[PDB]
C-alpha cells in the first residue's frame, strides 16, 4: 500500500484499487487506512463520499535502481519549464533591466 | 427576455405567447441564435425544455483581469498625453521677451 502510492505521481488512489493491491476486501481496507494515519506512516484525509484516500504525506521508500530512474525524469521535466519561461521572460521588457 | 424570466421553459409555452407556428419552427430560430451566444442557453429536445446557461458571479471567474488590462493602458496613454502637451505653451513663453 505505501509502495503503490509512492511510484505513482498521482497522490490519490481509490480504495477499491487498494483492495486489489493488498488482497483484502474493501471493508478491511478502510480500517487499515485509519490505522496508517495513527502510526503516521501515511498522512492525508479520508473521504467516503467518493471512496477515496487523498494523501499529503508518504514515507520515503527504500532506494533501488528502478525508483532512482523515476527521480531523474522528474527533475529533467521541471528543468524544461524553467528554461522555457526564463527566455520568454527575457524578451518581454527587454529594455528595462537596469 | 423570456429565457431571462423563465429558466426552464417548454417550447410549447414559447409558441403560444409570441405566436410562433410550432415547436419545430421555434427550435430552428433559437438553435442559430445560441451558437452566436445571444440568448445563451442550450436546447434539450429529448426532455423538452430550454435551459439558460448561467455564468452567475464573474468575479469568481477570471473575467476581471482582462477588464483591468485595458483600462491601465488608457490611464497610461493620458499621462504621456499630459506630458508632451504641457511643454508646448512653455517653450513659446520662455523665448519671448519679458519684463
Amino acid at each position: 500500500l505505501i509502495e503503490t502510492v509512492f511510484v505513482k505521481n498521482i497522490r490519490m488512489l481509490s480504495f477499491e484499487d487498494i483492495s486489489k493491491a493488498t488482497h483484502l476486501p474493501k471493508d478491511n481496507v478502510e480500517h487499515l487506512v485509519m490505522r496508517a494515519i495513527s502510526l503516521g506512516l501515511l498522512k492525508g484525509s479520508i473521504d467516503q463520499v467518493n471512496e477515496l484516500v487523498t494523501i499529503s504525506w508518504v514515507q520515503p521508500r527504500i532506494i533501488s535502481g528502478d525508483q532512482i530512474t523515476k527521480m531523474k525524469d522528474r527533475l529533467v521535466e521541471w528543468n524544461d519549464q524553467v528554461e522555457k519561461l526564463g527566455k520568454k521572460m527575457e524578451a518581454r521588457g527587454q529594455s528595462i533591466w537596469v | 427576455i423570456i429565457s431571462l424570466t423563465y429558466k426552464k421553459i417548454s417550447l410549447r409555452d414559447i409558441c403560444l405567447k409570441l405566436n410562433l407556428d410550432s415547436e419545430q419552427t421555434v427550435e430552428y430560430m433559437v438553435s442559430r441564435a445560441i451558437r452566436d451566444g445571444v440568448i445563451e442557453a442550450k436546447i434539450n429536445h429529448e426532455d423538452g425544455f430550454i435551459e439558460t446557461t448561467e455564468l452567475l458571479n464573474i468575479y469568481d471567474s477570471e473575467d476581471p483581469q482582462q477588464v483591468f488590462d485595458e483600462r491601465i493602458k488608457f490611464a497610461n496613454q493620458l499621462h504621456d498625453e499630459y506630458l508632451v502637451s504641457m511643454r508646448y505653451p512653455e517653450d513659446k513663453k520662455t523665448q519671448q521677451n519679458e519684463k
Binding site: M89, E90 | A75
Partner: protein, 135 residues
C-alpha cells in the same frame, strides 16, 4: 565546514567528514559604517526600485536552472562512476516530489481570486496618478 565524527551507517566503518554549515556575512558596527562609506554602487540587487528587483527576477530563474542541473548529473554519476549511495540526498528529493504543489488544489482557486485583488487595487492607484498629473 565542520569536522564531525559519526558512524556512516551502510556496513562502512566510522567516517570523519566535513558537513556543510551555511554561512553568512556580518559586520562589526565600527567596520560597517566604513564599509558602507567605501561602497556607493547601484548594485545587481539592492531591493530598490521596480526596475532593480526586475533584474533580480531574470537572475533568480537562471539561478534555479543551473542549480537543478547539478542534481541530474549526480544521479548519473552514481550508476556510471559508482559514487557511494547517499540515501540521505535521495531521501530529501523524495520530500521535494511529495510536498510538491499541484493544480486543481482549492489553492489554485484561492490564488486566482487573489490575482484579481492585486490588479484591481493597482488599477485604482493608476487612475489616481492621472488626477495628480492633470493638476
Amino acid at each position: 565546514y565542520v569536522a564531525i565524527e559519526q558512524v556512516k551507517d551502510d556496513g562502512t566503518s566510522t567516517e570523519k567528514t566535513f558537513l556543510h554549515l551555511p554561512c553568512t556575512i556580518e559586520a562589526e558596527e565600527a567596520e560597517e559604517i566604513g564599509v558602507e562609506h567605501l561602497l556607493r554602487d547601484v548594485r545587481d540587487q539592492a531591493a530598490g526600485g521596480l526596475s532593480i528587483r526586475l533584474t533580480n527576477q531574470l537572475k533568480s530563474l537562471k539561478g534555479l536552472q543551473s542549480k537543478l542541473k547539478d542534481v541530474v548529473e549526480y544521479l548519473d554519476k552514481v550508476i556510471n562512476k559508482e559514487l557511494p549511495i547517499n540515501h540521505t540526498i535521495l531521501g530529501k528529493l523524495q520530500d521535494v516530489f511529495n510536498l510538491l504543489p499541484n493544480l486543481g488544489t482549492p489553492d489554485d482557486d484561492e490564488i486566482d481570486v487573489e490575482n484579481h485583488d492585486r490588479i484591481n487595487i493597482s488599477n485604482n492607484l493608476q487612475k489616481a496618478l492621472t488626477v495628480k498629473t492633470n493638476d
